[PDB]
Every structure is written in C-alpha cells, then in structure tokens.
C-alpha cells in the first residue's frame, strides 16, 4: 500500500481546518442554540466549554492525529487499542452529521435558487404558499406571522404539523440536496479542493460577507435590545440543564470534535510541526466567527422584535431555521436585495460545502485507514465515495419530506450534537489523561512540537473536560426535559426513542469495541486489559 501523504504546505493544514471547523455551526447553529436557550445565559457555558474543553480537545484531537499519523479510528490503536471504539463512535457521529449538514446546505441552495428572480419571495404576502394571517413586517404595528416565517415554514419546509405525518417528498429540496451531493462528490472523487483558489475567495469572502452582515445588523433600529438579549444573561436560566449541554455540544460541534475529522487533518501534518499556535489561532477564529455572527443575527432579531411589536424571544423560530429567517429578513433591507441574497446564500453554501468536504474527507480517511490495500487510490475507493454519498443522500431524503424538519431537529439535537459528543469527548480525555497519561502524551508532544503542553491543556484533559462532560451528562439526565421543536411541538415517544437510538448508536461503539476486544483476546481479564491498554 502507498504511504500516507503529508500536507504539501503549512497553509494546506490551516486552510483545511479554517474551512473545516468554521462553517454552518457558527453562522447557523450557534444563533438558534443561543436564541432557544435565552440568549444571554447561553454564553456562560459556551465560554466555559470553549476554554475548559473546546480548544483543549480540539488541539488534543489534532495532535493525536499528528502523533499517530493515522485518522479517526486507527489513531487509537497507537494510544489505547482497548478504546478503539472512540474512533468508530467518531465515524458514526460524523456520518449522521454529514446527513443532516448536507440537508442544511439543501435548504441554503433552495433559498439561493429562489433568490434569482427580481423580487425576494420572503418579502411580501402575495404568494400561494402564504396564509390569510400574513401581515407585512412594516404593517404589523399599523396572531400575525411575518412573510419570512411563512416562506421558511410553508415553501422551503412545507411544514406538516407533526413528525407522524411525513407528507410527501419535496422534489424542490430533493433536487437541491442532489445538486449539493453532486458538488460534494465532484470535490472529493476528483480531489480538487480548489488548492489555487481557497487562498483568497474561500478564505476571506465568507468572512467579508459576515462583516457586511455585521454592518447591516448594527445599523437596524432596535438592534440594541437584540444585543441586550444576546449578551445579558439570566442566571435562573442556568439552573436548567439544556443551556449547559446545548452550549457544550455547540462547542464540540463547531470544532469538529468527536468526528475523526481533526484527527484526519492532523494526520497529514508533518511530525515535527508546531500545531499548538495554529490550533489556538484557528480556534480563536472559530469562536470569534460564532460570536460575531451572533452579534449580527441577534441585532437583526432585535430589529425584528422592534418592527413586529413582539418580544425578542418570540419573534422568530426557536429552532433550526433561525438563520433562514433573520438573515433573509436582513437581506430584504439591503440595497439591491436580490444580489445580496445571492451573495449570502453563496456564503452559506461556501461555508457548509467547505465543512462537508472536510468531514467527508475525515470519514473517508478513517474508513480507508481501517482497510489499506482495499480502498487503495481508485477503481474501488472511488466506488466507496459514491456509496457513502448515496447512502447519506438517501438518509438525507427523510429531512426533505413535509415533516422532515422534525427529523432534522431530531438528528441535530441527538445524532451528532448531544450526549454523544460529551460521551466521546469525555472518553478521549479520559483515555489520553489516565490510560495513556498526561505526562506520557506531553512527552510525545514535546518530542514532536518542541515543548510540553502547559497546565491548561494538561489539567483540561485530566480534570476539566471529564468533569464538564460527566456533569453535563448526568445533569441532563437527572433533570430531563424532552426535545421540543420551536418551543410548541411535543415530540412523540417513538421520535424521542429514535433520537436516543441515533445518540446511543454513536455511544455504543465504545462499549461494543471494548467487549469485542476483551472477548477476542485470550487469557484472564486482567491480562486482557493489560494487553489492550498498551499502545501498538
């Protein structure tokens, strides 16, 4: 088999994370998770997980990739072969994430194609998909729903009144999802990655458009009330466990933690490459992107609350369609709104596409690290690219149906951004800190970076990330409140069971692999554990 390649440049690693873990989890997910959990009170567990767990486990995952020169799963066969199920857990998480993430890009593409005509369809109440309750935004103050909300709910989503009624497959979103999957297949199976083009247009224009949205949102009237909602916290909201777990999994979501993606991108690093300053600068880039886009979108929501004469927490969707309400509403107040809509949904497509390329690459890299000499370079590996893309498309068709928004919120809360992320992050930190050793891994890091990680990273992998993950997990279990879509829908018991099935299929890769390896090896159980804890 051919040897595993390294990056062609120092900036090829940096541009693969900066498009990889700086994506829709910043401009789309952090806004509605902040919105749904009260705005101000979301930021305290956000920053607690960001410093205690986010950047530490992000650098930990990249530096695990750099040490082992392996991606996702087989990186754990040189650290602790007993806990190799962290890799399979990461692969399950990244597969479910690939499915619903590409569904987000399908919604963005449908908004992009619906932006091509000269009048934006979410701007006025004259269309077939609206209701008699439709009042224009300016006419609200002079049970009324805005045109952006009914556009999102009744043209894009075509929202059935339950998950029990899937309705019919929306061929608009189905063809949009197929187009984005053909784009993802053409950027992996060709292996282009736009190496001569991602230096400027990919790297800057999403952030330039985010700055444009910042300037637009701060100039809307009533943006100060929205920023007050965004920043000023409710301490009584922190007593509820959803704020803590939602912020922690948003941190573990934005950073591509528990996915194998950052191990895979770190696996292409050179051995004697200082990843620490790159990891810190790019983590600051990711968290700053989320926090800046939060300022923009919550200034827009404060304007929307001012214009419609309703409270800030009730003006838009407390669910996964906030970036498709507030941001299009802000687009409808830019000069020449059609062109700015085209640029915005090209922004969301660029961010989500760069992410989806990077985590599809991480999933493929993990699954070819499992089997060398089978998916070598082509004529068998290229078929498996199309197989992964086709199965993830067919699983993504369940979020295209008229009740597929509920399936999306199920996947988003449970499949790849919930207790599964806390589970795998706790197991990564526990393995590295105690079964490998903070001092042994620090010796490895000094051997290859140049210096040992400080008392921040060492004590974060040792104590802080395990206590945060264990506390948030048991705090969500002992004060359990079930999943609700847009604060009004109550999910049925089979839907909560399906979400827990996705989460546990992410979780149960670790105990299944532990039991499988403790059953395969011969000897007494203490000898079996002591053999499987030794790295290979």
């Amino acid at each position, epitope marked *: 088999p051919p040897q595993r390649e390294k990056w062609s440049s120092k900036i090829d690693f940096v541009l693969s994370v900066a498009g990889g873990f700086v994506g829709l989890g910043n401009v789309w997910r952090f806004p509605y998770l902040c919105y749904k959990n009260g705005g101000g009170a979301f930021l305290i567990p956000y920053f607690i997980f960001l410093f205690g767990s986010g950047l530490p486990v992000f650098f930990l995952e990249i530096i695990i990739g750099q040490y082992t020169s392996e991606g996702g799963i087989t990186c754990w066969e040189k650290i602790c072969p007993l806990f190799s199920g962290i890799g399979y857990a990461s692969v399950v998480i990244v597969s479910l994430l690939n499915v619903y993430y590409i569904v987000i890009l399908a919604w963005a593409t449908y908004y992009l194609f619906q932006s091509f005509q000269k009048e934006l369809p979410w701007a006025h109440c004259n269309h077939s998909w609206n209701t008699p309750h439709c009042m224009e935004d300016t006419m609200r103050k002079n049970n009324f729903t805005s045109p952006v909300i009914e556009f999102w709910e009744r043209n894009v989503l075509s929202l059935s009144p339950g998950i029990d009624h899937p309705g019919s497959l929306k061929w608009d979103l189905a063809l949009c999802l197929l187009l984005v999957w053909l784009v993802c297949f053409f950027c992996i199976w060709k292996g282009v990655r736009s190496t001569g083009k991602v230096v400027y247009f990919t790297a800057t224009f999403p952030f330039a458009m985010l700055l444009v949205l910042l300037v637009r949102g701060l100039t809307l009237p009533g943006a100060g009330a929205g920023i007050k909602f965004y920043l000023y916290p409710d301490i009584t909201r922190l007593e509820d466990p959803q704020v803590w777990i939602d912020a922690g999994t948003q941190i573990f979501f934005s950073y591509a933690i528990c996915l194998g993606a950052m191990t895979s991108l770190g696996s292409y690093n050179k051995y004697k490459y200082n990843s620490y300053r790159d990891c810190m600068l790019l983590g600051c880039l990711n968290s700053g992107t989320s926090f800046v886009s939060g300022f923009a979108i919550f200034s827009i929501l404060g304007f929307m609350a001012q214009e419609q004469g309703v409270d800030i927490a009730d003006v838009a969707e407390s669910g996964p369609g906030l970036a498709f309400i507030a941001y299009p509403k802000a687009v409808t107040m830019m000069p020449l709104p059609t062109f700015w809509s085209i640029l915005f949904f090209i922004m969301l497509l660029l961010l989500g596409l760069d992410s989806q390329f990077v985590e599809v690459e991480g999933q493929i890299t993990s699954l070819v690290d499992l089997y060398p000499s089978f998916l070598r370079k082509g004529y068998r590996r290229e078929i498996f690219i199309a197989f992964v893309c086709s199965i993830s498309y067919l699983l993504g068709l369940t979020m295209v149906t008229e009740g597929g928004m509920y399936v999306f919120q199920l996947f988003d809360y449970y499949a790849a951004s919930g207790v599964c992320l806390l589970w795998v992050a706790f197991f990564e930190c526990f393995v590295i800190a105690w079964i490998y050793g903070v001092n042994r891994f620090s*010796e490895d890091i000094r051997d290859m970076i140049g210096y040992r990680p400080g008392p921040w990273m060492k004590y974060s992998w040792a104590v802080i990330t395990p206590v945060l993950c264990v506390g948030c997990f048991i705090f969500s279990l002992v004060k359990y409140v079930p999943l609700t879509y847009n604060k009004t829908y109550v999910y049925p018991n089979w839907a909560i069971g399906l979400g827990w099935s996705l989460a546990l299929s992410s979780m149960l890769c670790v105990p299944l692999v532990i039991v499988i390896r403790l059953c395969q090896t011969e000897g007494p159980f203490l000898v079996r554990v002591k053999y499987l804890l030794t790295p290979r």
Partner: antibody
Amino acid sequence: EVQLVESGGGLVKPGGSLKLSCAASGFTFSSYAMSWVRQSPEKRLEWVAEISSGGRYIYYSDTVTGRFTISRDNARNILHLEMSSLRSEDTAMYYCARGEVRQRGFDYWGQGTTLTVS
Amino acid sequence: ENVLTQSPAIMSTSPGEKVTMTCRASSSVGSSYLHWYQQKSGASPKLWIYSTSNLASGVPARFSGSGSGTSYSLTISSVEAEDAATYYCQQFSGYPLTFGSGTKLEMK
C-alpha cells in the same frame, strides 16, 4: 534553585568505558528533557545525547550514534551517560543541559566533568 | 548534519562599540529554534538569546538577535568589560543537534 551537578570525571583508557552522573536538584526532573553537551579542548561545543522527559525519545549525534547510552533515574532525579569504545577523539568537558523547550534551549547548565582518554 | 558555520573566532573590539557576529546555517533553521549561548573563560555555557530574538534571564538589554532561515546574528549595542566571552549559535530543530563554532570576543 535549579542546580545540575555532574559527576564521573576521570581518565579512562582508549576503548574503555565511563558513566557520568548529572545529579539535578531544585526542580521536577521528570518534566524536563535532558541533554549531554560536551566541549572539546579546542572549545568546540557538540551536543552528544538527549533523553526526553520520561525517557522514551532518545537522540544521539552521529559521533556517538552507536556507543553512547543516556538514561535517567526520575526517582533520584539523576541523569546518566554510559560510554563504550571511547576513542582518542572523545576527550572533552561534559556538561548536562536542561533542554526541555526547543524554543527556549539549554536554559540551565551545570558544572563539568573532564573525560580524558590516553 | 546541520553544520552551523559561524563568524571567525578571533575578533577584538574596543569597549563601548557596537559589534555583531553572524551564524550561517547549512540547512534552514526555523527561527524559533536557533539559540545563542555565552560561555565565559573557564566556566560553563549559559543560555543568552533563545529563539534568535528573545533575551534570557540575566541577559542585559544591550544584547539583541536578528535573522531568520539561514543567516542569524547576535548584536551588542555597547560592549562592556563583562562581555568578553565566547558565543555559540545553536539550532535546536533537527534531531542531530549542532552547535556553532566559537566566536571569541576579547578586549584591546
């Protein structure tokens, strides 16, 4: 007060052996990689051998690449250097240098041990 | 090996005069890995400038370092009588670590 005290300085025959002993004090010896750096009578410094924090990464220069052995004793906070097949062009003045951060270098050195081969 | 060809050892300058000494590397040092050591007469070397720009503890502000990649330089703004020593550059990047040759600074 970080203090490195080297021991084992003396004359050996050609083809002989010697075992130096950098006895460190005032700091946690387990958390810093240690390097042996020798100084020729022409005052040309040459790095000899580096051992990592826990002793799993061991590096040698090409002049001692197959006949020098460097070890630690983290319980006693002492560093070693085992020599074999000591030739004539190995007479030097041996320092142990606390080189742990590669971007900070050999920040703390110690005393010396004159190794003489004749 | 990464042979660090340094400035010639025999240099003699008056006190209070700005001096410099260069350090040419055969390979490319990463400019955060090349350090400078001051060894006095009959004493052990000590770290003087690390990562070719920063000043170690106990090093006066009159010392400075510059350069990157191949050429690296140590510069004294005003040489005193206590600056009479031998200075070695040292890349601390490649696993066969190499010190530079001597550059002996003596008075007049």
